[PDB]
Design a binder for these strands. Structure first.
Ligand SMILES: [Mg+2]
Ligand SMILES: [Mg+2]
Ligand SMILES: [Mg+2]
Ligand SMILES: [Mg+2]
Ligand SMILES: [Mg+2]
Ligand SMILES: [Mg+2]
Ligand SMILES: [Mg+2]
Ligand SMILES: [Mg+2]
Ligand SMILES: [Mg+2]
Ligand SMILES: [Mg+2]
Ligand SMILES: [Mg+2]
Ligand SMILES: [Mg+2]
Ligand SMILES: [Mg+2]
Ligand SMILES: [Mg+2]
Ligand SMILES: [Mg+2]
Ligand SMILES: [Mg+2]
Ligand SMILES: [Mg+2]
Ligand SMILES: [Mg+2]
Ligand SMILES: [Mg+2]
Ligand SMILES: [Mg+2]
Ligand SMILES: [Mg+2]
Ligand SMILES: [Mg+2]
Ligand SMILES: [Mg+2]
Ligand SMILES: [Mg+2]
Ligand SMILES: [Mg+2]
Ligand SMILES: [Mg+2]
Ligand SMILES: [Mg+2]
Ligand SMILES: [Mg+2]
Ligand SMILES: [Mg+2]
Ligand SMILES: [Mg+2]
Ligand SMILES: [Mg+2]
Ligand SMILES: [Mg+2]
Ligand SMILES: [Mg+2]
Ligand SMILES: [Mg+2]
Ligand SMILES: [Mg+2]
Ligand SMILES: [Mg+2]
Ligand SMILES: [Mg+2]
Ligand SMILES: [Mg+2]
Ligand SMILES: [Mg+2]
Ligand SMILES: [Mg+2]
Lengths: 188, 182, 260
RNA sequence: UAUCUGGUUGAUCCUGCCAGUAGUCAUAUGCUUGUCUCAAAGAUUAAGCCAUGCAUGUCUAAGUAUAAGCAAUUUAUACAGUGAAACUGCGAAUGGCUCAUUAAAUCAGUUAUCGUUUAUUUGAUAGUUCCUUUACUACAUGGAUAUCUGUGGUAAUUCUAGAGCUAAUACAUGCUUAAAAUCUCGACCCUUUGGAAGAGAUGUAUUUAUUAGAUAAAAAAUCAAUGUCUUCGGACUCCUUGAUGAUUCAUAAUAACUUUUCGAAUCGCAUGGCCUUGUGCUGGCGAUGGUUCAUUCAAAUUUCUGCCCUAUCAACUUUCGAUGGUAGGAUAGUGGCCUACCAUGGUUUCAACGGGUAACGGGGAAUAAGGGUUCGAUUCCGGAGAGGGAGCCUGAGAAACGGCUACCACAUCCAAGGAAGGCAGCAGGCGCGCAAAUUACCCAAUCCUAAUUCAGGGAGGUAGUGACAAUAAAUAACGAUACAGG
RNA sequence: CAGCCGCGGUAAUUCCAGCUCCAGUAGCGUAUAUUAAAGUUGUUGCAGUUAAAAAGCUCGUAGUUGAACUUUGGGUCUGGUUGUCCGGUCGGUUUUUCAACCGGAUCUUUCCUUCUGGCUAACCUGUACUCCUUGUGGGUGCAGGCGAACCAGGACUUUUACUUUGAAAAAAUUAGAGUGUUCAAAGCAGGCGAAAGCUCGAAUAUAUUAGCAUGGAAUAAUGGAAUAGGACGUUUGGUUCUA
RNA sequence: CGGCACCUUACGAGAAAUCAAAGUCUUUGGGUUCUGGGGGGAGUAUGGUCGCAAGGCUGAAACUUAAAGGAAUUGACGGAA
RNA sequence: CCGUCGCUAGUACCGAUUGAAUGGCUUAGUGAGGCCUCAGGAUUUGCUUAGAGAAGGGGGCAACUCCAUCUCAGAGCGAAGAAUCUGGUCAAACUUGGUCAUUUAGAGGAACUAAAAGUCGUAACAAGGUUUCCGUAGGUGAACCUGCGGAAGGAUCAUUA
């Protein structure tokens, strides 16, 4: 029904291409998922070659990742903070790929407390040595720290949840992060 | 769905109908070699025509060079086998002018008459039709057979049937019966 | 149309079957196997039209069921199993061991091979990749995939496969001046040495190849198969031995050799 | 197998056409028609309408069988011989038909998928499911549902409501089988050369991150971090890496998530090897499943170039995607395929755009000096369609029509409440028309499908009708006598 | 009746019947298409003073076309390919006396793309000089080093058109080889033994549009050094590197 | 050297009048534009377009018909000489 | 030999009917049916130790030397799961309009063609009895006339000084 035909689309010039054949299944495109954040729901869809393809619906949670540390966690999402394609996805609050979001962050904090164990926002004798050996490696780019303190880390989700089902993304760092922040500021 | 069985409307009418001289010639030819129709003559012409065309084509390429050399040679050989070409003439440019008369002369029509057997062309034809004459020991009953020259000496009366002399044949039998009755 | 096509019409059937134009509507569609439809040979065509050990399809089927046929060690029961180039068909009753090898004209010649040679299969190299768990594996243009090949077995080389075990006996490196056998188009079935390799970035690597008669020809790389070193091929090739004579020459041969 | 003749004229030579002539697997028709082989055959009008019948289903030593079936007798004190029925499987997306659309579309050759899916195919292949480690599911886990047998409704329909049992490679659950190595955690001593008892995590898929996946040559000074062997001046040496023309490729690690895929509670034969003499632990020939990678069958797209007539179509496209961008969404995947935001492009007298086609494209056909011209519904390859247009289930593969759902148009069956339909399969009928065959015989061939030697097959063949077209040729021959020519 | 020309108006060879007779023959007529004929659609290949046809005239963008000029000539060897000179021979074959024809290497004021390196095959060699007819007949043999005998990587190509051979243009069709369907139209068959087994086949060629490949450099265009911002390189400084 | 101009043979042409171009064309190819394809129906119908109009440019078919033409030859004829 | 006006046939042309028909696009309004979607929960059950009557309800009075125990009130926790249903989306079709193409009735009009013998002229052809044409205006009963300019296919390749 909803097709991906280049049969329709007039032409490069403009001539109205007549309806050559009734559109096929292999040309199809399904209805959009546009996953929100409100109770965990998934529906698969039997695609071409069989092959299930999990559609995220109202997806809560997902493993958002650090770059500097090289880690990710069983972490909740809060809200759709800024989506750069369309702002209608921020009113309705529809999570998607490369939409900027705020991350529960508690899990991250916990992990840090194991990893380095110096705390963000503001025992045992040989493990002390280990701790000493670690830490003072990554100083973190201020904004991130603030987010951590808040309980709301700025990420960009990069799993396509309408295709994958999972809602796994990326803690924002550096220049891109800054840009995103700026955009957010402009919006608000 | 198997495949189209191929055919040729082989044997082709002339481009004018009533070229009087031509007609006369045709008639004469028929008389000479006892044909049922002009159709046969036309067929013969077509056969010869094709050969002529082939020869022309060959000529249009260089003799020495390959296709011309080989295909032409093969054609010549075939002609010789048939017995239309002579043994003096095996130079392609000789085939070019073979003539229909020659072709006619090579038929099992005439190669009965030429070898005696029949007596009078038409008679020979009739004999051929009526299940006599075996070129090998296999009964030919096509007049327009074209004898192989290599198997022209082998043209005999049939193993079976009369004249060859296996069985006397029907009327004779009747006569015998009558005699017996008497 | 609407999915995979299941028939093969007898005219559309590939010519190197050498099938009758007439005698039935269809030809046997060689099923999914280790060889490409048109570059294959089904077990019907082999046991009926070539060998004539079966007078008909039914007979062939019966033979298959009886399980005297073995295409490359394993048994086979499918009428239309595509036995392709280099495949070794052994009929255990008769002991008529065959390797499917091309004639100079192109069609598959019935090569009545000995029992000792019909044992391995020479096969090309299509790919060299690594699979899961970091294991390097070679692929053959003649079906198989063999794990763990000698690191210097690269693409378009040839490989003597033990066949019974399905391993690697030996290999030939593709290079200048190494006996090669042809499997594509106008030169299909010939045999030669290898002179050049026109590299060409993307658009088909050509190969200038001379035969025993010093007659040069060119083919694409995919259409060439490395059969040995000049003088010593690794397989017994049929009468003619990939020479391919001129038409005139052939004619001469025919009409000189009249031995009644 | 290069050919011209009649016609203006009072007569003449031209322009010029008409007319003849020849051919057409080009149709029709008019006469006629003995035989052999060969054989197209409801395309042209109406992709008009269709009574009836048939054209897809199918089980092996090997999925299930207490038919209260057959047949029965010298494996069943859980089963074992055949097997209706049904659930599971697979098939029904091939084939056949037809040419309505359709004019850069289809199609032809030519590339590409580093741009993807691919049941089947043959090749391959998964000790890590555990989660603190002093008493726990294995020599076999569960309850259903159909056949049946029973209780029925209905005017009807390949209609199926209730009970009773009863299975499965149904469909759900679910066991074993570690060593090592690497990464996160850790009782202290002894003032450095610092150095470790021991605790947790690490399959495969999934996701984004992140690293490796190297490679144009030789030789240094020393500044910050400061390691190994010290034969306590100091030395430092042997230091990893596939393929492509080309990658963020193959692929392998670090990190997590995961409504944790997968990881054989599977069927037929056969019944071996050690005794720690238990019925112990062990081991053969096969079937099917199941993972991504191959392959094969394919699949969508996609590169380049090529179409019939028309200017009595010169502008078109762009509000309602046109062209491009950015991002998303979707898709198996590429992509204005769709959405948001922005830019103003894009095509065109090298005929864009529009209109027409009594246009499906090509292979090819007819004609035939050379060049051509016309035709191609139609045996092969592609493409479309199943009255029209739409939508979707199942499935590896359908936007299927011998599947479904709707609306329109047509129509059937009725007890009027409601049911069922789709011959452009074959045969046949009407209808239309100048114009086209038997409601036959069979799977023996040809090949095709499945659980598959075994069944099925209007695909296919076999005849029937058949002057479509083509080939081969009987329709007296030899005498004698009798009358004439040479 | 008559395609057309035309026949019919009391002598019809053209109408309607008999006989003769012609043509074709199990076929032959008619109708419409269509191809040939039609050089009456013309590129090959037409016409335009008067037969139809030159715009009343000039201008003019597209298109279509467009003068001549840059590497010619000579030598020196060296491969063939058929006629010749006898068959030197058991109707076929191997040289010479000769030939034209098609190449190849070179040298001619001449580069054919150039190098960073791999292999330097070879002797331009001469290190010991001799297995040895009186010898420059002949080779065990390795420091300087001819590189075309090949690669494997740069550097950057004036770009076409044209033509070459090649690789690809499914089978059926077409052309076409072989072969006794009895002949042929066909068909892919067949053929030969002891007739205990053996054995030839199922070719070849076309299709030229576009793409791929290679040789050719005439023809036709295109391009380059004229603010030389040009070319080289023992430049000598530098500047930006990259590593 | 240049544009508004006779005679013969034409071997060149041409159906011929004639033509020194209307030649170098079946011994067919210097470079280009435009026009024509039996006669009539018809420069009409229609649509376009151009105009104040009259008209212009553009431009059919149905249907019809065996001739329409050209050039000359001999005649016949002419209120031609 | 040329026109007008007659007669008989046929072809097309225009043309009021607020014509008729088919199809293609198409405004606005409606909008079937599925797909996803928001829910919705007929029913089916597993595991919980949740108390039985049970006659060894685990190997001899007894939390059975209590067994997937006799089995329903549990109730909690699930898994699957119909009608029904909230928004999308694809969108057939319908309703009423609008539009392009092709057809097709069509009173009347105004043409053209054919045919052998109709009517009034004699336009052209001979200097055709005003020489023909062409363009153009204007007139007429019809050829046609007549201005103007042009042409000779002219009725002249000719008048010297
Ligand atoms: Mg799969
Ligand atoms: Mg007899
Ligand atoms: Mg490639
Ligand atoms: Mg001609
Ligand atoms: Mg005249
Ligand atoms: Mg006359
Ligand atoms: Mg004619
Ligand atoms: Mg029809
Ligand atoms: Mg089909
Ligand atoms: Mg990296
Ligand atoms: Mg990767
Ligand atoms: Mg995108
Ligand atoms: Mg066509
Ligand atoms: Mg059509
Ligand atoms: Mg067609
Ligand atoms: Mg049609
Ligand atoms: Mg088809
Ligand atoms: Mg119908
Ligand atoms: Mg449908
Ligand atoms: Mg049907
Ligand atoms: Mg079907
Ligand atoms: Mg039918
Ligand atoms: Mg008929
Ligand atoms: Mg059929
Ligand atoms: Mg009959
Ligand atoms: Mg007979
Ligand atoms: Mg008379
Ligand atoms: Mg013509
Ligand atoms: Mg003409
Ligand atoms: Mg004129
Ligand atoms: Mg003029
Ligand atoms: Mg004018
Ligand atoms: Mg020039
Ligand atoms: Mg032929
Ligand atoms: Mg005309
Ligand atoms: Mg709705
Ligand atoms: Mg006067
Ligand atoms: Mg007058
Ligand atoms: Mg006058
Ligand atoms: Mg007046």
């Amino acid at each position: 029904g909803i097709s991906r035909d280049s049969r329709h689309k007039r032409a490069a010039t403009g001539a109205k291409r007549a309806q050559f054949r009734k559109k096929r299944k292999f040309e199809l495109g399904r209805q959009a998922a546009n996953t929100k954040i409100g109770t965990k729901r998934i529906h698969p869809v039997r695609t071409r070659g069989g092959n299930q393809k999990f559609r995220a619906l109202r997806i809560e949670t997902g493993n958002f990742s650090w770059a500097s540390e090289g880690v990710a966690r069983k972490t909740r999402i809060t809200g759709v903070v800024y989506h750069p394609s369309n702002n209608e996805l921020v009113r309705t609050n529809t999570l998607t790929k490369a939409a900027i979001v705020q991350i529960d962050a508690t899990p991250f904090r916990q992990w840090y407390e194991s990893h380095y164990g110096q705390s963000l926002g503001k025992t045992s004798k040989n493990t002390e040595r280990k701790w000493a050996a670690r830490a003072a490696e990554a100083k973190i780019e201020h904004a991130v720290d603030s987010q951590f303190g808040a309980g709301r880390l700025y990420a960009a989700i990069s799993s396509r949840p309408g295709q994958s089902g999972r809602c796994d993304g990326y803690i924002l760092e550096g220049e891109e992060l800054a840009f995103y922040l700026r955009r957010l500021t402009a919006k608000k | 769905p198997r495949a189209p069985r191929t055919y040729s409307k082989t044997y082709s009418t002339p481009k004018r109908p009533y070229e009087s001289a031509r007609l006369d010639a045709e008639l004469k030819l028929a008389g000479e070699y006892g044909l049922k129709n002009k159709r046969e003559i036309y067929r013969i012409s077509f056969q010869l025509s094709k050969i002529r065309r082939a020869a022309r084509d060959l000529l249009t390429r260089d003799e020495k060079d390959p296709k011309r050399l080989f295909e032409g040679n093969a054609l010549i050989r075939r002609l010789v086998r048939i017995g239309v070409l002579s043994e003096d003439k095996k130079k392609l440019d000789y085939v070019l002018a073979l003539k229909v008369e020659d072709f006619l002369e090579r038929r099992l029509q005439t190669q009965v008459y030429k070898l005696g057997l029949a007596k009078s062309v038409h008679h020979a034809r009739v004999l051929i039709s009526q299940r006599h004459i075996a070129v090998g020991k296999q009964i030919v009953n096509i007049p327009s057979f074209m004898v192989r020259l290599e198997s022209e000496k082998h043209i005999d009366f049939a193993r079976t049937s009369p004249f060859g002399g296996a069985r006397p044949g029907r009327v004779a039998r009747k006569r015998a019966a009558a005699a017996g009755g008497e | 149309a609407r999915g995979p096509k299941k028939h093969l019409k007898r005219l559309a059937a590939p010519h190197h079957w050498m099938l009758d134009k007439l005698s039935g509507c269809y030809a046997p569609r060689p099923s999914a196997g280790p060889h490409k439809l048109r570059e294959s040979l089904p077990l019907i065509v082999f046991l009926r039209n070539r060998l004539k050990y079966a007078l008909n399809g039914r007979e062939v089927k019966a033979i298959l069921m009886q399980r005297h046929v073995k295409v490359d060690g394993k048994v086979r029961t499918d009428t239309t199993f595509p036995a392709g180039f280099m495949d070794v068909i052994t009929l255990e009753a008769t002991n008529e061991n065959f390797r499917l090898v091309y004639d100079v004209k192109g069609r598959f010649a019935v090569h009545r091979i000995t029992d000792e040679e019909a044992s391995y299969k020479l096969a090309k190299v299509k790919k060299v990749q690594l699979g899961k768990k970091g294991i390097p594996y070679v692929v053959t243009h003649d079906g198989r995939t063999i794990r763990y090949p000698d690191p210097n077995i690269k693409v378009n080389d040839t490989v003597k496969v033990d066949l019974a075990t399905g391993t690697i006996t030996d290999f030939i490196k593709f290079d200048t001046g190494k006996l090669v056998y042809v499997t594509g188009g106008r030169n299909l079935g010939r045999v030669g040495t290898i002179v050049h390799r026109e590299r060409h970035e993307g658009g088909f690597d050509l190969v200038h190849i001379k035969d025993s008669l010093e007659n040069t020809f060119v083919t694409r790389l995919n259409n060439v198969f490395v059969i040995g070193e000049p003088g010593r091929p690794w397989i017994s090739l049929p009468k003619g031995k990939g020479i391919k004579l001129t038409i005139s020459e052939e004619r001469d041969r025919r009409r000189a050799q009249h031995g009644l």
